[PDB]
Nucleic acid binder design. Structure first.
Lengths: 56, 61, 65, 40, 191
RNA sequence: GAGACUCUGGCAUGCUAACUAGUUACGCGACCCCCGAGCGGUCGGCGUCCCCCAACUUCUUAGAGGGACAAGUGGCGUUCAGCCACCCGAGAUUGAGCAAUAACAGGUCUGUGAUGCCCUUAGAUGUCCGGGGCUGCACGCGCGCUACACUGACUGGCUCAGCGUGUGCCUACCCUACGCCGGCAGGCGCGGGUAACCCGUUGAACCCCAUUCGUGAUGGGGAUCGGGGAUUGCAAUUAUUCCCCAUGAACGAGGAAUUCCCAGUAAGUGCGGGUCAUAAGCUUGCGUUGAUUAAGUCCCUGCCCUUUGUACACACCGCCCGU
């Protein structure tokens, strides 16, 4: 797309730590749960409980 | 019967809007005699007035 | 147009005296420096206001608990 | 989410809040001294 | 010059501001004089700091008015400088005395407040302070010459001088006096 | 949540260092040549002469640290909290930015490939092309521009800023020195600039100094209408903008009513950016000249706290009695 010449670029996938201080990771997790019928109550408390276990 | 008077101390504002002010004065010719009067404008302790009605003895308005 | 100190300012002034009453005296610009040296405040202006209440306070401690 | 990293750690986010204050305890402001000439 | 301060020509001395009440508010006879109108002019921050302003500078400030002329000190100095010169011819006397005499006998001594008795309009005579006498004097003199010179062949300099001379003395045919006596009339009515 | 916090403004002859922000003293290293004087020294200068081995303080250059805290003083105070006048100095401070719980059937499906449900879908509500209209006029309402003149209009000469932007864009395009021709619409040639290096010392207006006019709906005022010129584009009619001659209306400080605002603030004056093939009576920033009046209160309009009273609770735009 961006018209860079060949070989001018390189990609590195990288593991992350601290699943519970970032938020986007929690939001995208929360997405599919709500899609699959689940209770808005059980889920919201669960992610909330997990984030607090993390260190926030 | 025009008169003069210096100011001694300011008591408080008055009026429907806080424009007049209560003062106490002595007449600059005898020191014992004294009255209290309403004035308009910025007035400070240490001033001199040109009284016409030499006696009114005003009260709370 | 008014100048009152808040709880953060006052409480720390209390704690500082209750530890370091020997370091301090009656001069502001020395009391200023020692507070910087012992404590780690995030801001220059907060540093100032604390000490100014400290010094006011020492003059009370001279006489009368 | 509100982060805790108030002083530094592995990584320091713009150290501490403008209003949180920490005193250090002396342990040493006692010093019952006398005119001892302890050369050293 | 290290002993006298003119406006270039005439002097702040040889004049006697002749009252006690209107003392302490007029800066003309004081040895703290100035060669010219406006300085910087810090004299607006506090409450009573405006009392320590030279009286001509006060006058100069008030002239430029009615929107067609704002921020035109220099124009007004031209008017003032021409104005004091024309005074000099007609009577051969320091205009400063002619100025204070007007300011003296132009400040109303009595007025009525708008104490409408909580919505039932009926006033009550009161007394007036020195500083407000000084201000309404200047305001009345300035809005004299102006309306006289609006659609006329005279200019502000002549009309200013004419009203000024007629107010120093009691001429009874000047805007300043015709209003001053009116206000005293109304006060004595609802006295 | 307020405060604290961030940005900006105001101070430092102290530090740091400089042709791509950039000088200022010395040498004048040159000023040109008399560049004036004058029979000479001495004064004069803004750019023109450079590599850059003649200083950086004072613009804007920009980083660090410093500085102001009701600290010293006199009164007042439950002598606590704190308040007023002062000594040195900037003495609460221009200022903005960020902004809580609970909410309104507030607005936006015409900002979105954010989306439900209904409608339509080859003779289309899709998507292209030609033209027109969104601007049409017996009337009413609001945000603004110009003016009602002599504190002025016209004609010539003097003298000073700052925030900014600028060439190849996602599907189409710059700011301009210098010369030559004509008033501008301009138009031909060459140069500079991917930028405080070019425009650029951004030679701005109002102001200021001198001539003409003299209360005359007058040379104030410039709507309306005729005629001619040029420029953008594929295309100027319902004149899209601009220039020149003529045309020369209402309007004499505005009734009841009502808006905004107390320090570099109001007001006057004009430069830039957005929109932009063509362009500002609008908005957003910028400087420039620079006042009057207050330093108080709850009377009109509204807000917060406590006490009280209630037949209201979609909550006084309420409930409600009779003929």
């Amino acid at each position: 797309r961006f018209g860079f010449p060949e070989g001018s670029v390189e990609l590195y996938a990288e593991k992350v730590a601290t699943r519970g201080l970032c938020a986007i990771a929690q939001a995208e997790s929360l997405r599919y749960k709500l899609l699959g019928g689940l209770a808005v109550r059980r889920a919201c408390y669960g992610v909330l409980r997990f984030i607090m276990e993390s260190g926030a | 019967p025009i008169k003069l008077a210096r100011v001694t101390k300011v008591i408080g504002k008055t009026g429907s809007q806080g424009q007049c002010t209560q003062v106490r004065v002595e007449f600059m010719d005898d020191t014992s005699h004294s009255t209290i009067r309403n004035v308009k404008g910025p007035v400070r302790e240490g001033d001199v007035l040109t009284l016409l009605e030499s006696e009114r003895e005003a009260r709370r308005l | 147009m008014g100048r009152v100190r808040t709880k953060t300012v006052k409480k720390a002034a209390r704690v500082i005296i209750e530890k370091y009453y020997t370091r301090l005296g009656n001069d502001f610009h020395t009391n200023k420096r020692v507070c910087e040296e012992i404590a780690i405040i995030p801001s220059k202006k907060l540093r100032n206001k604390i000490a100014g209440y400290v010094t006011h306070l020492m003059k009370r401690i001279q006489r009368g608990p | 989410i509100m982060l805790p990293w108030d002083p530094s750690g592995k990584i320091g986010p713009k150290k501490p809040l403008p209003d949180h204050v920490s005193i250090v305890e002396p342990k040493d402001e006692i010093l019952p001294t006398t005119p001892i000439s302890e050369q050293k | 010059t290290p002993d006298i301060k003119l406006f270039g020509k005439w002097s702040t001395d040889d004049v006697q501001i002749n009252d006690i009440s209107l003392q302490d508010y007029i800066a003309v006879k004081e040895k703290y004089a100035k060669y010219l109108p406006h300085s910087a002019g810090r004299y607006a921050a506090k409450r009573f700091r405006k009392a320590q302003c030279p009286i001509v500078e006060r006058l100069t400030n008030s002239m430029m008015m009615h929107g067609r002329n704002n921020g035109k000190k220099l124009m007004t100095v031209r008017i003032v400088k021409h104005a004091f010169e024309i005074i000099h011819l007609l009577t051969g006397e320091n205009p400063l005395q002619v100025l204070v005499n007007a300011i003296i006998n132009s400040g109303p001594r009595e007025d009525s407040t708008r104490i409408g008795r909580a919505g039932t309009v009926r006033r009550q005579a009161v007394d007036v302070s020195p500083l407000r006498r000084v201000n309404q004097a200047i305001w009345l003199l300035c809005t004299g010459a102006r309306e006289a010179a609006f659609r006329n062949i005279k200019t502000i300099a002549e009309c200013l001088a004419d009203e000024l001379i007629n107010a120093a003395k009691g001429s009874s045919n000047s805007y300043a006096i015709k209003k001053k006596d009116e206000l005293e009339r109304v006060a004595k009515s609802n006295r």
